[PDB]
Amino acid sequence: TTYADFIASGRTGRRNAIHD
Amino acid sequence: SEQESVKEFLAKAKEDFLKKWENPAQNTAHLDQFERIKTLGTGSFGRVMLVKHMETGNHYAMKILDKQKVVKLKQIEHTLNEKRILQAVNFPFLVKLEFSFKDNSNLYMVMEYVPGGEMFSHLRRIGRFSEPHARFYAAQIVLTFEYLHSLDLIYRDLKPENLLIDQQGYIQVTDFGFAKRVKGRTWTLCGTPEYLAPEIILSKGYNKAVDWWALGVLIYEMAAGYPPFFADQPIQIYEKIVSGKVRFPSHFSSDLKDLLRNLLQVDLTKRFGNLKNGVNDIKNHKWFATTDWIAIYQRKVEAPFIPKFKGPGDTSNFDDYEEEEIRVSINEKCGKEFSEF
Ligand SMILES: C[C@@H](N)[C@H]1CC[C@H](C(=O)Nc2ccncc2)CC1
Questions:
Q1: Would residue B335 be called left, alpha or beta, if left means φ above 0 and alpha means ψ between -120 and 50 degrees?
Q2: Checking phi first, is residue A15 left (phi over 0); if not, alpha (psi -120 to 50) or beta?
Q3: Chain A contact present for B11, CB below 8 A
Q4: Residue numbers for the site described as Important for inhibition (chain A)?
């Protein structure tokens, strides 16, 4: 499932803004 | 007549904004007036801490930015924008700035402490919000952007990390680090990768329509539990955003799918919020048929979720961070760059 793919991904934590 | 009332309210709110915009408050407190308790969150330039005002016993959240770090990251104008805008705005769903000041090392902004924690924490723990819960939050953001955009402001960093839940279960938008007052187009590549509109990635020059795209992403993430475009690498996320390809989970209502196709429209001249009816295309959409916009504004609707609060100074709705000392140099750093702060 997409949910399982998301939960196993590297981006489930707090996401930093980009500046550059 | 409802539309005319909104219009009159906004006309007055613009006049109040402009007097503060033109004559900003400066240096309204000093560090030693505050007892530092605990760190509530971090960013690239510093951190936000729970503090107590000794003269009044009131608790606040203090944002601390290291001037040398801001210069190194070329965020001087963005930081000046943030403070100038935040001191001038007044709206029920915007965090209130109470004091600002600076010393030799740091910039400081002292805001109301919002104890319910970040939407992000609750969303990750529960998994996803039901459509009515998501709708309640979305309404508040729609009204907030109506206010902001009428003042020529673009917000540019909508995401659950930046949305705080108060005692009454309503949202407060914090972190104005990328907000900018601008009449025409602007070009800076800034924001968070999952939330960026295609016109930002494509270097096209862009306007307020980027906030409406970001609201599409937020609504999807709240209702699905994950964002419409995710991947382990930012470059991979950008590919997905520009492609024009969205899949909706099968549990989305047909009305929600419809809203979302119109907000996540790669074509600017077709995106809800950027057509001739402006924000009214969003507010008149079927998905929002049960929303009483005035009741939301007045905070009279019962919130679907109220955070547990165990008295003043309680931080149990926030994660723990490592604590770091606040070092204040004996030499003034970067005085000219920040003279207007
Ligand atoms: C972009 C993120 N890194 C950032 C989100 C806002 C957060 C904050 O202001 N927290 C807060 C403010 C007022 N009251 C309680 C918490 C700090 C971290």
A1: alpha
A2: beta
A3: no
A4: 11, 14-15
B14 backbone dihedrals φ, ψ, rounded to 5°? -60, -45
Residue of B nearest to A17 (CA): B192
Structural determination approach: X-ray
Give the residue among B212, B50, B42 at the shortest CA–CA distance from B115.
Answer: B50
B176, B85 in Cβ contact below 8 A?
A: yes
With a Cβ cut-off of 6 Å, ligand 1 is lined by: B 40-41, 43, 48, 61, 95, 111, 113-114, 161-162, 164, 174-175
Q: Cβ of B124 under 8 Å from any chain A Cβ?
A: yes
Q: What is d(CA B111, CA B166) in angstroms, rounded to the nearest whole number?
A: 13
CATH class in words for B6-23+118-308: mainly alpha
| Alpha carbons B206 and B111: distance in angstroms, whole number | 30
B234: its two tokens: 């930012």
- Each domain of chain B, given as residue ranges in start order, spans 6-23+118-308, 24-117+309-339
Q: For residue B140, give the DSSP letter.
A: H
Q: Measured between alpha carbons, how far is B156 from B197 in angstroms, rounded to an integer?
A: 10
SS3 B324: coil
B267 is known as an active-site residue: no
Q: What radius of gyration do chain A's Cα atoms show? A: 11
Q: CATH topology for B24-117+309-339?
A: Phosphorylase Kinase; domain 1 (3.30.200)
